[PDB]
Design a protein around this ligand. Structure first.
Ligand SMILES: *[C@@H]1O[C@H](CO)[C@@H](O[C@@H]2O[C@H](CO)[C@@H](O[C@@H]3O[C@H](CO)[C@@H](O)[C@H](O)[C@@H]3O)[C@H](O)[C@H]2NC(C)=O)[C@H](O)[C@H]1NC(C)=O
Ligand SMILES: *[C@@H]1O[C@H](CO)[C@@H](O[C@@H]2O[C@H](CO)[C@@H](O[C@@H]3O[C@H](CO)[C@@H](O)[C@H](O)[C@@H]3O)[C@H](O)[C@H]2NC(C)=O)[C@H](O)[C@H]1NC(C)=O
Ligand SMILES: *[C@@H]1O[C@H](CO)[C@@H](O[C@@H]2O[C@H](CO)[C@@H](O)[C@H](O)[C@H]2NC(C)=O)[C@H](O)[C@H]1NC(C)=O
Ligand SMILES: *[C@@H]1O[C@H](CO)[C@@H](O[C@@H]2O[C@H](CO)[C@@H](O)[C@H](O)[C@H]2NC(C)=O)[C@H](O)[C@H]1NC(C)=O
Ligand SMILES: *[C@@H]1O[C@H](CO)[C@@H](O[C@@H]2O[C@H](CO)[C@@H](O)[C@H](O)[C@H]2NC(C)=O)[C@H](O)[C@H]1NC(C)=O
Ligand SMILES: *[C@@H]1O[C@H](CO)[C@@H](O[C@@H]2O[C@H](CO)[C@@H](O)[C@H](O)[C@H]2NC(C)=O)[C@H](O)[C@H]1NC(C)=O
Ligand SMILES: *[C@@H]1O[C@H](CO)[C@@H](O[C@@H]2O[C@H](CO)[C@@H](O)[C@H](O)[C@H]2NC(C)=O)[C@H](O)[C@H]1NC(C)=O
Ligand SMILES: *[C@@H]1O[C@H](CO)[C@@H](O)[C@H](O)[C@H]1NC(C)=O
Ligand SMILES: *[C@@H]1O[C@H](CO)[C@@H](O)[C@H](O)[C@H]1NC(C)=O
Ligand SMILES: *[C@@H]1O[C@H](CO)[C@@H](O)[C@H](O)[C@H]1NC(C)=O
Ligand SMILES: *[C@@H]1O[C@H](CO)[C@@H](O)[C@H](O)[C@H]1NC(C)=O
Ligand SMILES: *[C@@H]1O[C@H](CO)[C@@H](O)[C@H](O)[C@H]1NC(C)=O
Ligand SMILES: *[C@@H]1O[C@H](CO)[C@@H](O)[C@H](O)[C@H]1NC(C)=O
Ligand SMILES: *[C@@H]1O[C@H](CO)[C@@H](O)[C@H](O)[C@H]1NC(C)=O
Ligand SMILES: *[C@@H]1O[C@H](CO)[C@@H](O)[C@H](O)[C@H]1NC(C)=O
Ligand SMILES: *[C@@H]1O[C@H](CO)[C@@H](O)[C@H](O)[C@H]1NC(C)=O
Lengths: 483, 691
């Protein structure tokens, strides 16, 4: 007989596919909830009306400052406690712990005080990096399992008992990462749902909140130099706020429970004891031992650029250029347009499979580069509503470049390293460098302009990727070996 | 609008309404345009008792009107146009009791139109144009008591026109503002009983007054008003016939009595009330008020000339039963040694602005009141500046003494209040200056009220209490004096003090915590305190244990101060608080911790012109309490505004919505339950996984 094992392997592949889809859906849902709550608290705490009526003598700006700090400075220390961590619970249970920490941070948003927001902010900061690490490890490992199952089904005796694919899991990793980042960038549009359905109708017209804005664009001189003290025409009723926050808690709990249940178990105890054969006294320094890797010294600027560009797409274009001609009424639509652009670019890069590996990457490194030029000469006048599609198309192209670069880097880092521990350490280093980039943008706020730094960093990444390819073709044969 | 009355005044109606309910009994059609009163339109109303159509314009009155009103008692025709009157006007209607016919241009009476009202009590024909007092041809008006014929053109009185009142008792005969120049013999004798007689603003003179006085022989007249009669000089033969009467009241005011001869009132042995206000007496003779040994009320207000009148000694020796002597608003030069001698039954004497220059008050001033049981003494606006010792020793029964509205400036040594054993009230407000002394009020232990408003009181910060012997003091007023040195040992033992006013002072630096010695506590011991006032002093801080013994505190006043924050537990002892006044302050927040027991049973609240912050955390409970309560806050929609934040600047507090605050929705309980279930779920799933 042979049809029973055929159907068996079919069910295993279907389970792998649905588990990847559920993990992606839960990640995007929890990230959208987090972004929406953060945006709602940033807009609701930037007015003397709300801050003085509801809180008054509470030191709310201090609360926001300490929260932003504990969110942006903690991820660094995450490196000091993420490897063993992701090897303690597992590759999937750390994802659940991270989404639970996110749900806890959302829960502490109700009463809103110091001793309840500061610890939740520290937990979110220390979990934002292991979340991405375990997420990438899970996606890559499940793509590898799908590929090995397909190969063992189509080739029973041809596949050798150890290390089947031999660099042939790219067509199965790319099609997974594409839909994964499609969902992750659709999360950006999903995060703007509460602000659209509740907050976008409570702020008055841009004629008064954008009054003392003398110049913007290339002459920003900060995140928001000129702006009004208040933004809401009427103070939101407590009932609408509590129902919105309860809906947010409900959808976050739904995401967390679908991550828990619709994942099964993809760890097995054999690999557990295999990795425990290494020990705890060595796992601390393997991410520090991998600094001798040749490919990392040329890819660290890529991670720094990824962090800088996601922070620019989050704040630089929306709060630096999108706030000029139009106020907070069309910022949500701007973010949704950026999200749809990135989601379309995800499948656009998915189409780029027949071409070799380092083709779309630098391609993205060009397109937004052009936008950088557009972000260096063109400066929109704030007190005029003549051109409104230029911002939309600029955000669309920026999201296109962002999605292309991110997906390409993900597939590249998944292809260059196939061993499980290698994927773990490499994703850890990638996400720690991304967190360092985010922390630098946090410190890089309220300066003159950050477009020159962006263009120089993109040029550096382009040169580094070209160097990496040119030395990888002529065969170096350099790789660290610390079992 | 219609509660047993028909209010139609200032509403402008031309015809009588026919839509008012039939249960009405009083109408009021004044200031309207009523022209006629048809009897057919009044068929619906029959239980009427009071009718008022005054201040209108009606030519003739419909004669058959009263036929359908068998209960009509009040009928008013004020300011109407009924000149000629007919006999058939009131013929078959006899239940009428009042009749007002003021301002009607009535010229003359032809044939007894007022003959079929056997129940008429009050009849008025004033403001008319009658030239004779003839109202009938036979005996009529058996129960008439008031007949007002004033403001007419009557030239002379005859018995042939008054013989119709032979079987009646005219309680009041208003003949004021007339030109009576002749009194026919026996004119007043035609009336059965004549009680009141009002001839005001009538040009009489000495001769006419003597003729009127001699005509009233064998008459039962009780009151006689001759005000504004221009009576210049009287003699002992003027009120000659008055000895054949029982007159008890006499009004000789506004007549400019220049000279009053001796024994001018010797023929009034039973007179009880005598009025002499507003005259021009040049010299009050010695034997002027002779024979008035029964008058118990004398009014000499403005009786003497302005700018000087002469008063001889023993001028009131014959006023034995004088129980009320009022001589205010005059220019007596000074009090003689035997001016008020012979007043054995006096109980009231008012001397407000009665002297030109009464500077010093020696011990020999009120010697004429040694045998007088005076009870109320009024000495105001007399320019009093100095009071010597033993100035009131001759007044043992004096209870209420007043020296206010003067320029009194001396150091109260306590020797001036000697001889006041039964003193109860002392009024010393609106003076120059009084310096207190250790034994200032030691000779008046029976005191119960002390007013010291606007005196600029000093020397109060003595080591002992100046009000210590005032163990029976109930009301104290030390306001408008700009005092700044008050000790804590000032109001001990005064556990019956009920009213205390301390406004317009400088008690700000005494309640502060930064002064040497600490905040002063001068409100201790006062248990029966009821009224309190500390308005316009500039207060900044309030102690916590200052309102300890103020149990029965009803009304308090802390307005016009510089208060911004109030400490906690400062109204806990206000178990009977009724009113609160915190206007013109700098109060921002109203919290439960400091306005808790104050807003329990408060009646009238006043916090006008206060800069409240339009924040929920500060005034949430305040707005919730203003939402529903029984305390009335006057002028709340236009005087209770907000200053900060600028978004709510100039916004009334009544429009503040408390549905958006930290206690509107229970998100704290939601946070607790969510965090708990999340932590328990995480712990249990880690336990299941680790097994
Ligand atoms: C002023 O008042 C005096 C005192 O009341 C009046 O004198 C009194 O007049 C009445 C009525 O005539 C006298 O009553 C009569 O007494 C006699 C006995 O003498 C008796 O037979 C009668 O049947 C009737 O009761 C009363 O005695 C008399 N009293 C005195 C002390 O004289 C006087 O009439 C009054 N005058 C006026 C004008 O009102
Ligand atoms: C009201 O007060 C005045 C002033 O205090 C009193 O007048 C005083 O009367 C006594 C008694 O005559 C006078 O005493 C006299 O002293 C002289 C020596 O200075 C002596 O020679 C005489 O024999 C007599 O004792 C006193 O001088 C006098 N005071 C003044 C300022 O003249 C008056 O007695 C008081 N009246 C009452 C009713 O209390
Ligand atoms: C924020 O906006 C408010 C109005 O939306 C501005 O207030 C105005 O200020 C000018 C300057 O004195 C006044 O002439 C106007 O009457 C004000 N408008 C009002 C009171 O409605 C305020 O200046 C703005 N501030 C900033 C920093 O942008
Ligand atoms: C009404 O008053 C006159 C005024 O005195 C009284 O007339 C006196 O009457 C007595 C007794 O007849 C005489 O002795 C007097 O000489 C009369 N006085 C005169 C004429 O001036 C008269 O008595 C009084 N009427 C009554 C009823 O007593
Ligand atoms: C005559 O004058 C006296 C003195 O005013 C009147 O007696 C007072 O009348 C008023 C009005 O009814 C009362 O309120 C007072 O109590 C009376 N004073 C008393 C009785 O001592 C008297 O009413 C007048 N008589 C007439 C007929 O008008
Ligand atoms: C002494 O006389 C004065 C003047 O008549 C009295 O002052 C009046 O008091 C009444 C009572 O409240 C007020 O309604 C008036 O307005 C006051 N008039 C003035 C001009 O001040 C004073 O009350 C009298 N004192 C006593 C003890 O009777
Ligand atoms: C203070 O007030 C009290 C209470 O009214 C007075 O005590 C009364 O005095 C009278 C006068 O002899 C007695 O008839 C009462 O029996 C007393 N009653 C009580 C309860 O003691 C007291 O005399 C007043 N003090 C002064 C100095 O007048
Ligand atoms: C409000 O904004 C619109 C946007 O174009 C503008 O046309 C209008 O003049 C503004 N109203 C003002 C400035 O009063
Ligand atoms: C009765 O009163 C009504 C109400 O105004 C009026 O219309 C009507 O003319 C009156 N009747 C007579 C006869 O005046
Ligand atoms: C009419 O007046 C009488 C007496 O005041 C009262 O009892 C009755 O209720 C009134 N009618 C109406 C309809 O109110
Ligand atoms: C009618 O009303 C006026 C104004 O209120 C009042 O002065 C007058 O006494 C009233 N008349 C009657 C008879 O009620
Ligand atoms: C007058 O009043 C009496 C009793 O108040 C009553 O019996 C009578 O009907 C009324 N009307 C007339 C015309 O007497
Ligand atoms: C008036 O009074 C006299 C005396 O009592 C009496 O005889 C007469 O009948 C009375 N007049 C009338 C109309 O009753
Ligand atoms: C009034 O006094 C004069 C002067 O002594 C005297 O001649 C006359 O008789 C007196 N008249 C009366 C009625 O007392
Ligand atoms: C009143 O009597 C006094 C004292 O006998 C006397 O001086 C005065 O002239 C008399 N006046 C008249 C008008 O008789
Ligand atoms: C009390 O609050 C309710 C709810 O906002 C409102 O409908 C009502 O008008 C308020 N009443 C007063 C007297 O402010």
């Amino acid at each position: 007989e042979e049809e029973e094992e055929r159907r068996y392997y079919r069910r295993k592949r279907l389970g792998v596919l649905k588990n990847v889809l559920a993990a992606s859906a839960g990640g995007m849902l929890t990230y959208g909830v987090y972004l929406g709550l953060l945006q709602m608290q940033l807009i609701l705490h930037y007015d003397e009306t709300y801050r003085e009526v509801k809180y008054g003598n509470m030191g709310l700006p201090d609360i926001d400052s300490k929260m932003l700090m504990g969110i942006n400075v903690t991820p660094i220390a995450a490196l000091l406690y993420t490897p063993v961590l992701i090897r303690f619970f597992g590759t999937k249970w750390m994802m659940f712990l991270a989404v639970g920490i996110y749900a806890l941070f959302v829960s502490t948003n109700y009463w809103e005080r110091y001793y309840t927001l500061v610890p939740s902010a520290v937990a979110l900061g220390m979990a934002i990096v292991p979340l991405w690490a375990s997420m990438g490890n899970y996606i890559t490992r499940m793509a590898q399992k799908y590929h090995e199952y397909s190969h063992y089904k189509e080739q029973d005796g041809q596949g050798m008992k150890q290390r089947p694919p031999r660099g042939s899991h790219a067509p199965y990793l790319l099609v997974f990462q594409a839909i994964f980042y499609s969902f992750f960038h659709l999360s950006f549009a999903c995060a703007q749902l509460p602000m659209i359905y509740f907050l976008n109708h409570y702020l008055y017209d841009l004629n008064h909140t954008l009054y003392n804005v003398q110049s913007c664009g290339t002459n920003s001189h900060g995140i928001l130099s000129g702006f009004n003290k208040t933004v809401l025409r009427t103070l939101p009723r407590s009932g609408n706020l509590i129902v919105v926050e309860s809906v947010l808690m409900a959808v976050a709990f739904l995401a967390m429970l679908l991550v828990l249940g619709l994942c099964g178990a993809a760890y097995r105890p054999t690999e557990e004891i295999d990795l425990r054969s290494v020990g705890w006294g060595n796992i601390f320094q393997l991410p520090f031992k991998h600094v001798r890797d040749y490919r990392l010294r040329h890819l660290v600027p890529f991670f720094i650029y990824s962090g800088f560009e996601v922070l620019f797409a989050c704040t630089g274009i929306a709060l630096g250029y999108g706030v000029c001609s139009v106020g907070l009424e069309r910022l949500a639509y701007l973010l949704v347009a950026y999200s749809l652009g990135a989601s379309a670019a995800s499948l656009l890069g998915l189409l780029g499979l027949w071409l070799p590996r380092p083709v779309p990457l630098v391609a993205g490194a060009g397109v937004h580069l052009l936008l950088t030029f557009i972000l260096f000469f063109w400066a929109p006048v704030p007190r005029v509503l003549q051109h409104s599609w230029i911002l939309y198309v600029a955000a669309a192209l920026w999201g296109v470049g962002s999605a292309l670069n991110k997906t390409g880097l993900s597939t590249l880092l998944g292809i260059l390293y196939e061993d499980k521990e290698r994927q773990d350490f490499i994703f850890t280093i990638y996400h720690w460098w991304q967190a360092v980039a985010i922390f630098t943008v946090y410190l890089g706020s309220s300066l003159h302009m950050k477009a020159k730094l962006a263009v120089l960093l993109v040029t550096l990444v382009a040169a580094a990727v070209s160097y990496l390819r040119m030395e990888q073709k002529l065969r170096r044969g350099v790789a660290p070996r610390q079992p | 609008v219609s509660h047993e009355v028909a209010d139609c005044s200032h509403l402008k109606l031309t015809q009588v309404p026919d839509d008012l309910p039939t249960n009405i009994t009083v109408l009021n059609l004044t200031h309207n345009q009523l022209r006629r009163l048809p009897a057919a339109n009044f068929t619906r109303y029959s239980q009427l008792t009071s009718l008022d159509v005054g201040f209108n314009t009606i030519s003739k009155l419909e004669p058959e009107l009263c036929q359908k009103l068998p209960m009509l008692k009040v009928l008013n025709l004020q300011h109407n146009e009924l000149s000629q009157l007919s006999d058939k006007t009131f013929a078959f209607c006899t239940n009428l009791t009042e009749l007002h016919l003021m301002s009607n241009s009535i010229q003359k009476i032809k044939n007894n139109p007022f003959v079929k009202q056997k129940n008429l009590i009050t009849l008025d024909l004033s403001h008319n144009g009658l030239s004779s007092t003839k109202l009938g041809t036979q005996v009529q008006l058996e129960n008439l008591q008031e007949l007002l014929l004033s403001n007419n053109k009557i030239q002379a009185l005859k018995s042939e026109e008054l013989d119709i009142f032979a079987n009646s008792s005219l309680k009041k005969l208003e003949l004021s503002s007339n030109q009576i120049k002749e009194f026919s013999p026996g004119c007043f004798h035609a009336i059965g009983r004549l009680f009141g007689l009002f001839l005001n603003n009538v040009q009489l003179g000495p001769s006419l007054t003597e003729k009127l006085c001699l005509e009233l022989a064998n008459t039962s007249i009780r009151n006689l008003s001759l005000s504004n009669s221009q009576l210049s000089t009287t003699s002992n033969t003027t009120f000659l016939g008055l000895k054949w009467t029982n007159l008890t009241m006499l009004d000789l005011s506004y007549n400019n009595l220049n000279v009053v001869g001796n024994d001018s009132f010797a023929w009034l042995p039973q007179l009880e009330y005598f009025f002499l206000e507003y005259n021009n007496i040049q010299h009050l003779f010695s034997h002027s008020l002779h024979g008035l040994f029964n008058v118990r009320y004398l009014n000499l207000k403005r009786s003497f000339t302005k700018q000087l009148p002469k008063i001889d000694d023993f001028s009131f020796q014959w006023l034995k039963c004088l129980e009320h002597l009022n001589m205010e608003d005059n220019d007596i030069p000074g009090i003689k040694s035997n001016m008020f001698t012979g007043l054995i039954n006096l109980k009231y004497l008012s001397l407000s602005n009665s002297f030109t220059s009464l500077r010093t008050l020696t011990n020999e001033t009120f010697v004429s009141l040694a045998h007088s049981p005076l009870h109320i003494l009024n000495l105001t606006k007399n320019k009093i500046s100095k009071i010597e010792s033993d100035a009131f020793s001759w007044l043992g029964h004096l209870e209420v003494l007043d020296l206010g509205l003067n320029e009194i400036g001396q150091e109260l040594t306590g020797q001036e209040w000697r001889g006041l054993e039964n003193i109860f009230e002392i009024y010393l407000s609106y003076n120059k200056y009084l310096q207190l002394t250790r034994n200032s009020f030691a000779l008046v232990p029976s005191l119960q009220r002390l007013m010291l408003r606007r005196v600029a009181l000093k020397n109060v910060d003595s080591s002992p209490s100046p009000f210590q012997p005032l163990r029976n003091l109930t009301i104290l007023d030390l306001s408008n004096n700009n005092i700044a040195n008050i000790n804590d040992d000032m109001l001990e033992g005064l556990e019956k003090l009920e009213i205390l006013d301390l406004q317009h002072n400088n008690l700000a630096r005494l309640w502060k915590h930064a002064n040497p010695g600490g905040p002063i506590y001068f409100l201790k011991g006062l248990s029966h305190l009821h009224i309190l006032n500390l308005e316009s002093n500039g207060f900044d801080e309030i102690p916590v244990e200052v309102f300890k013994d103020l149990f029965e505190l009803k009304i308090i006043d802390l307005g016009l101060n510089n208060l911004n924050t109030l400490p906690a537990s400062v109204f806990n002892n206000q178990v009977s608080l009724k009113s609160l006044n915190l206007q013109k302050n700098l109060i921002t927040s109203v919290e439960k911790k400091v306005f808790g027991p104050a807003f329990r049973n408060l009646t009238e609240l006043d916090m006008r012109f206060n800069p409240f912050d339009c924040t929920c955390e500060s005034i949430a409970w305040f707005v919730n309490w203003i939402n529903e309560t029984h305390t009335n806050i006057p002028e709340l929609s236009s005087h209770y505004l907000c200053n900060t934040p600028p978004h709510y600047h100039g916004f009334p507090v009544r429009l503040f919505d408390t549905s958006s605050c930290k206690d509107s929705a229970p998100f704290e309980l939601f946070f607790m339950i969510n965090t708990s279930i999340l932590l328990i779920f995480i712990f249990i799933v880690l336990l299941i996984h680790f097994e």
